Amino acid sequence: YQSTIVPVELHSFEDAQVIGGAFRDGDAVVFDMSLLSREEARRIVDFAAGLCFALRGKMQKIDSVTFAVVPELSNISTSELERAARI
Amino acid sequence: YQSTIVPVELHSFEDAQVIGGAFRDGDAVVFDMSLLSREEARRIVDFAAGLCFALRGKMQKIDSVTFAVVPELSNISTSELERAA
Amino acid sequence: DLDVPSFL
Amino acid sequence: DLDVPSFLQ
Secondary structure, eight states, X not given: OOOOEEEEEOSSGXXXXXXXXXXXXXXXXXXXXTTSOHHHHHHHHHXXXXXXXXXXXXXXXXXXXXXXXXXXXXXXXXXXXXXXXXX | OOOOEEEXXXXXXXXXXXXXXXXXXXXXXXXXXXXXXXXXXXXXXXXXXXXXXXXXXXXXXXXXXXXXXXXXXOOOOHHHHHHHX | OOOXXXXX | OOXXXXXXX
C-alpha cells in the first residue's frame, strides 16, 4: 500500500499525540527529537514502540535524534524517510 | 463472568511484548513492576500508553507498582482488576 | 511520580 | 544509547 510521509518536529513532549494520530491513520511518520531533553526523547521512543507494536508497524532509527514508524502494509525506504526529514 | 485478565510480571523492558500481545488480542492486562527500577517502570508505562493510544484503550494505576491496560469496550470494572491483583 | 499520561 | 527495542529489530 502507498503511504504519505508525515514529518514531525517535536516542539514539546505533548507532541506524541501527533505521531500517534498520523500513524494510526495509516501514515508513515518521521520524527525529530533535537528540541527535547534526553529523558523526553527516551519517553517518545517508548511510546512510538507501543504504537508500532499495537498496529504491527515497523520502527527504525535514522540518526541520534530521528526515528520513524512505518505502517505494516507500507514499503517506505530509508532514503524516502531521510528526504522527508530533510537529512 | 470469566473475562480475560492477563497477569504479567515484568523483569525487563523486553517483557513489554507480553503486555502488547494480550492487549492487541482484546484482553485486559494487569502488570506488576515491583522487580523494575523506577526508570524501567517509566519505560513500561510509556510503551503501554502507546498501545492504549493505538487501540483506543484505557489505562489505570492500581497502586505504585501495578497498572492495567483495558480494551475500549471491555465489560471489566476497576474492582475486578483490583480483585485479580 | 509514576502516572497515566495527561492525554489518557 | 537511544535505540529501537529488540522485538522491533
